[PDB]
């Protein structure tokens, strides 16, 4: 079903980015806000808005270069069938340090570049390539 | 401070003794999936106060029999 809504979130981003869609909407949650707000601060997307309180609806503004996909590919890493965890020195890089890896720790959701100054490890969410 | 386990009781038919099952999450050495592993211990039950399905706290003691090596501390929740 919708057992991995983060994988459902990454499905809706990769489709609309490739099919030249201007903006998408999706059901919101606390975890989907904490990931899209990081992608807004890392130049991958443009803006996010929330709509509705009894039915929380998250919106994302897409981003293009000259009509080209900014987010070329994104890869869900951990999953409910197999959980993935790393330490503070085993955090993997994406495209040898070009792409970022979204890792949620006890100090909130940050990147692997931001986790070096934080010195923590935890759950890998997605490889933002 | 001392070494202390917690679990649940699966068998209580015998006198002065109960069977407490211990579950633990194990990263698989080849695949990494967290798997529930059942550890079945034999715990000395003084006065036979533990029933079935009771969450219970146990500690370590000397071997009192051929199979027993654990004793009772207190019952966390009884007869829910």
């Amino acid at each position: 079903s919708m057992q991995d809504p983060i994988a459902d979130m990454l499905t809706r981003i990769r489709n609309g980015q490739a099919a030249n869609k201007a903006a998408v909407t999706m059901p919101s949650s606390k975890l989907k806000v904490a990931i899209a707000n990081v992608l807004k601060e890392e130049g991958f997307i443009e803006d996010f808005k929330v709509e509705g309180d009894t039915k929380p609806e998250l919106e994302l503004t897409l981003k293009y270069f000259q009509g080209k996909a900014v987010v070329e590919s994104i890869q869900r890493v951990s999953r409910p069938g197999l959980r993935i965890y790393k330490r503070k020195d085993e955090l993997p890089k994406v495209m040898a340090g070009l792409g970022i890896a979204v890792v949620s720790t006890s100090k909130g959701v940050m990147t692997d570049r931001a986790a070096r100054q934080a010195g923590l490890g935890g759950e890998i969410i997605c490889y933002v390539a | 401070k001392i070494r202390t386990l917690q679990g649940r009781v699966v068998s209580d038919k015998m006198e002065k003794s109960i069977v407490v099952a211990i579950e633990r999450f194990v990263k698989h050495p080849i695949y990494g999936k967290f798997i529930k592993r059942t550890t079945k211990l034999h715990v000395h039950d003084e006065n036979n106060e533990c029933g079935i399905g009771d969450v219970v706290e146990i500690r370590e003691c000397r071997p009192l029999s051929k199979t027993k090596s654990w004793t009772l501390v207190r019952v966390v929740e009884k007869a829910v």
Binding site: G81, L82 | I30, Y31, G32, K33, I35
Partner: peptide, 14 residues
């Protein structure tokens, strides 16, 4: 292909 399938029985080496 499923990891949870290989929990019951691993890949059979010939």
């Amino acid at each position: 292909a499923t990891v949870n399938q290989l929990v019951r029985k691993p890949r059979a080496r010939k």
